[PDB]
C-alpha cells in the first residue's frame, strides 16, 4: 500500500562544447498514507527514467509522522532557505487548502483537513522541503508530556 | 523599522494612477475622429494597424485602435471609446467600440460577434 504522486516535471539544459544537451528532472512524493512520507528527486535523459529515480530516492528518504485523527496536531511554521511555509489544523470537513506543491505532500501524508500558506519564494522544491521539515519538527502532546516529566492531563 | 520609527513616520502606500486617464473613471466615452490612419507595430510584429486620433468629451486628444477587419470610420465620425491597451502599438491606450454610435460592426463576423458589434445572422 504505497501511493506515488508526481509534484512537477522540469526540463534542464547542459551545455557541451559542440551543442546544447537536454535533461529531465522530476520530483515525486511517495508514502504509506498514514504515518510515513518521502520525497525524491530523479534526473534522467528520459522522463520516465527520471520519474523512477525520483521514486527510488523518495522510498529511502521516508520519515515517520504522528497525526491526530485526520488533522495536524498544532500550527507549524517552517523555513527552508528563502521559502516559508505555514500550516494550521482545521476541523473535520474543511479539506486540504494548499497550492499544489504543499497539496501533493499533504495528500501523501494522508491529512484530510489543513490550511496552508506560503511566503517569499514559491519554488516547489523549497516548499516541499520546508513542509517536510515542518512535519518532522511536529511533536505530539504525549511526547511533550514525557519531555516535561508531567502527566498528559496536567498540561493542556 | 522599529516600533517608535513606525509610530513617528509610519508606512505609506503610493497610489497607482489610472492607465486610462481619458475615460475619467468611466466605462466608455464619446469622441469625434480627428484622424483615421494606419501605423506600424513594435519590433517583433509587422502590420498596418488601424488607429484613430479622437477628441473625447473629456477634453483629451487620445489615440484609439479599431479592431476587426474593415471599418467605416473617417473624419468627423462620432465614436465610442473604451479602455484597453494595444501591446505592440506605443501610445495607443484605448479601443473603439464597434457598432456603438457610428462605427459599424464587422460585416461577416460570426464567432465573436458581440465583441465587434455584429448582429446575429438570421
Amino acid at each position: 500500500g504505497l501511493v506515488e504522486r508526481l509534484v512537477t516535471v522540469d526540463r534542464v539544459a547542459k551545455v557541451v562544447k559542440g551543442g546544447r544537451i537536454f535533461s529531465f528532472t522530476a520530483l515525486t512524493v511517495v508514502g504509506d498514507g498514514n504515518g510515513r512520507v518521502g520525497f525524491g528527486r530523479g534526473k534522467a535523459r528520459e522522463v520516465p527514467a527520471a520519474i523512477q529515480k525520483a521514486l527510488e530516492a523518495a522510498k529511502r528518504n521516508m520519515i515517520t509522522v504522528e497525526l491526530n485523527d485526520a488533522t495536524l496536531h498544532h500550527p507549524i511554521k517552517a523555513r527552508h532557505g528563502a521559502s516559508k511555509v505555514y500550516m494550521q489544523p482545521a476541523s473535520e470537513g474543511t479539506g486540504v487548502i494548499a497550492g499544489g506543491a504543499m497539496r501533493a505532500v499533504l495528500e501523501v501524508a494522508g491529512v484530510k483537513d489543513v490550511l496552508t500558506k506560503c511566503y517569499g519564494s514559491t519554488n516547489t522544491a523549497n516548499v516541499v522541503r520546508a513542509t517536510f521539515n515542518g512535519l518532522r519538527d511536529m511533536s505530539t502532546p504525549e511526547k511533550m508530556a514525557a519531555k516535561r516529566g508531567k502527566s498528559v492531563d496536567e498540561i493542556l | 523599522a522599529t516600533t517608535n520609527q513606525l509610530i513617528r513616520k509610519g508606512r505609506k502606500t503610493i497610489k497607482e494612477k489610472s492607465k486610462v486617464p481619458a475615460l475619467q473613471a468611466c466605462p466608455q466615452r464619446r469622441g469625434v475622429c480627428t484622424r483615421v490612419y494606419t501605423t506600424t507595430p513594435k519590433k517583433p510584429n509587422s502590420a498596418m494597424r488601424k488607429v484613430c486620433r479622437v477628441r473625447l468629451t473629456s477634453g483629451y486628444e487620445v489615440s484609439s485602435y479599431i479592431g476587426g477587419e474593415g471599418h467605416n470610420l473617417q473624419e468627423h465620425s462620432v465614436v465610442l471609446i473604451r479602455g484597453g491597451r494595444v501591446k505592440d502599438l506605443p501610445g495607443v491606450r484605448y479601443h473603439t467600440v464597434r457598432g456603438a454610435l457610428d462605427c459599424a460592426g464587422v460585416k461577416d463576423r460570426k464567432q465573436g460577434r458581440s465583441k465587434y458589434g455584429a448582429k446575429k445572422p438570421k
Binding site: - | 516600533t3 517608535n4 509610530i7
Partner: protein, 79 residues
C-alpha cells in the same frame, strides 16, 4: 464632575492659571502608548499657586472664553 491633576505651566495671567495634563493614549494600529500633554486653563481667585505647582481642577460653567475650570485644591509646592 471630572477632576484632573496637573502642573501649572504659567501663572502670569491675572486671576488665571494654565495647567498641563499628562495622559496615555494607545496607538490604534501599533498598540503602543504615547505620552500626550494638553494645556488647560483654570480660574484661580486668589492666585494661590505659583508656576510649577501641582493642582487639581474640575469642570465648571465658562467663566471666560477659554477657561472652564476652577482650582479647588493645591496638593504640593515646588521646592
Amino acid at each position: 464632575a471630572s477632576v484632573l491633576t496637573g502642573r501649572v505651566v504659567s501663572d502670569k495671567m491675572d486671576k488665571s492659571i494654565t495647567v498641563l495634563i499628562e495622559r496615555l493614549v494607545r496607538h490604534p494600529l501599533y498598540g503602543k502608548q504615547l505620552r500626550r500633554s494638553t494645556k488647560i486653563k483654570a480660574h484661580d481667585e486668589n492666585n494661590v499657586c505659583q508656576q510649577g505647582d501641582l493642582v487639581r481642577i474640575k469642570e465648571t460653567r465658562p467663566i471666560s472664553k477659554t477657561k472652564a475650570w476652577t482650582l479647588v485644591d493645591v496638593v504640593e509646592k515646588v521646592e
